[PDB]
Amino acid sequence: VTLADAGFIKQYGDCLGDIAARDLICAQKFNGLTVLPPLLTDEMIAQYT
C-alpha cells in the first residue's frame, strides 16, 4: 500500500520552486487542503501489535 502524503512536515524546502509543479500535494496544500498526522506513529502501532 502506497500513501499520498502522511502529514509529515512539508518544511517549505522541497515544495518551493521545482516540486510545486510536478506534485499534486503542493497544488492541494497551496489551496488550503492539508493532511494531519495520526497520533500513533507506525512505530507505536507496531509496538502495540
Ligand X SMILES: *[C@@H]1O[C@H](CO)[C@@H](O[C@@H]2O[C@H](CO)[C@@H](O)[C@H](O)[C@H]2NC(C)=O)[C@H](O)[C@H]1NC(C)=O
Q: C-alpha cell of 47?
A: 509496538
Contacts of 10 (CB under 8 A, 6+ apart): 25, 29
Q: Closer to ligand X at the Cβ: 1 or 36?
A: 36
Per CB under 8 A, does 27 bind another protein?
yes
CB-based contact 35:29 (threshold 8 Å) = no
Least distance (Å) from ligand X to the CB of residue 17? 15
Per CB under 8 A, does 46 bind another protein?
no
List interacting residues with another protein (CB under 8 A).
1-4, 7-13, 15-18, 20-21, 24, 27-31, 33-34, 36-41, 43-44
